[PDB]
Design a protein around this ligand. Structure first.
Ligand SMILES: [Mg+2]
Ligand SMILES: [Mg+2]
Ligand SMILES: [Mg+2]
Ligand SMILES: [Mg+2]
Ligand SMILES: [Mg+2]
Ligand SMILES: [Mg+2]
Lengths: 194, 194, 194
DNA sequence: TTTT
DNA sequence: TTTT
DNA sequence: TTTT
């Protein structure tokens, strides 16, 4: 989608927030990606991933057939105050809502139905979208058409949690500080080295 | 092979028996596959796997050149009594025998020769084939033509073990019970939910 | 490159030395590869690997633009005394030097710059090249053009270490002894078996 | 961002 | 079912 | 040998 990758280069984004905040390898590996993005000026690049992608509009439609909500697609929404940070929600719902859509493996979809509550990393994803957009709630949608009709669609609403947001902004600010510093640090070793 | 996948949909089968019976992740992941098969009405889908497949008839021939046995290819043989359970032996040998063929990685083949006894998961595979067909023995064949002639072929006979069979049928019955129930359970949550 | 694989069949080589010498799975898996190579008469066969390969000549050039050294490309150099053992340096530098080139993932390249010292497995690689060729030093080069100019190139010299070489030759001799024996052992079981 |  |  |  080209112009959009450009808006994401070297930025922390909602779908990567669990990695930032994990108590671990994934935090440093993510840090390493973004360091490389900022330095090199571009990014790097499966079958289940490829379905989640094609079937996304199918779910967007379904959410509407089910709710009658007015849904606007948007690009990257930069955090209001924190620089180098943003979100790409799957939709603006109404005046104060959002939609985040998954179209995963059937068994995953089943477990979401089984438990009624989305995985904690998606909580972090959704809270961050809310932080970035100032929205009040996000409707979490899981879709899979391979199943019987009465099992294809699941929705659950997730309320903005200002406490969790405050933490995230702390952690993301911390993580961003290290990241900038690290780049700085490297630029200064390499340059003196002339 | 189309019509055959149909005979396997949502069924426990001989080659998956070690997963059922393991003391673990693989049991639940298998359970999850079959739950999804039954619900969705279809299945999901490497280089060593691709050889084992092409070279299989090469081994079938070799077994005959070596034994002079009369070998009949068959499809899925449903367990005589337990429903949703079956086997696909690589052959009916004689009136009371079977053949199960592997054409693995050379080093694997070498280890089979080194030890003379097939991996325990293939024991379970073969016992199950015997359970399903009522046969008396299975000739386990390992083949690899990449090696010198005097190392390409290995055969060892495995006698029906009624004790092990009894266990398997217990475990598979248990596992099937959970599987049906789980589907049932899900169908009833989803349906009341209307 | 065909004629070169032929010179490597069933041989221990510099880039596999860390596997030989590890205190582990990788030693036996390597042993297994070479056993299979010798027995079958051939070998088995990603995106980062594919770059390291294309970009190698780019680095060779750069090393020269930076040093003005006279660099000769060579094939496999068999150890002077130990049979079934060899090295493929990325270059003969001068009369007494070598070059070993990496063109890895950016982040890896960055860590090499960060620490100034190559990973211990490359130490083993380079020492072995020196053992095989009798050279006095190897210039370790890490290259990545995706980065800013002042970060693309890193070089560090590694001096021949006769102590480490002596060990390697012991370990490789040991490992080779087992490997020959194992083949022997197998040939004799299989052959009596006639 | 896309799925585990 | 196909190989680890 | 090529990268982790
Ligand atoms: Mg999104
Ligand atoms: Mg989504
Ligand atoms: Mg079979
Ligand atoms: Mg088979
Ligand atoms: Mg080399
Ligand atoms: Mg190299």
């Amino acid at each position: 989608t080209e112009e959009w990758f450009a808006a994401r280069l070297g930025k922390v984004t909602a779908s990567r927030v669990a990695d930032v905040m994990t108590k671990a390898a994934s935090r440093q590996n993510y840090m390493a990606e973004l360091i490389c993005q900022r330095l090199t000026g571009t990014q790097e690049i499966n079958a289940a991933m490829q379905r989640g992608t094609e079937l996304e509009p199918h779910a967007r439609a379904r959410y509407i057939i089910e709710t009658g909500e007015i849904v606007t697609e948007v690009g990257l929404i930069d955090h209001p105050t924190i620089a180098g940070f943003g979100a790409s929600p799957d939709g603006l719902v109404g005046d104060t809502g959002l939609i985040e859509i998954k179209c995963p493996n059937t068994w995953t979809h089943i477990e979401t139905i089984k438990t009624g509550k989305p995985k904690p990393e998606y909580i972090k994803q959704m809270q961050t979208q809310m932080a970035c957009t100032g929205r009040q709630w996000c409707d979490f949608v899981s879709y899979d058409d391979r199943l019987p009709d009465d099992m294809q669609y699941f929705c659950t609403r997730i309320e903005r949690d200002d406490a969790l947001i405050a933490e995230i902004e702390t952690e993301v600010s911390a993580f961003l500080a290290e990241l900038e510093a690290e780049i700085e640090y490297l630029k200064r070793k390499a340059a003196k080295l002339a």
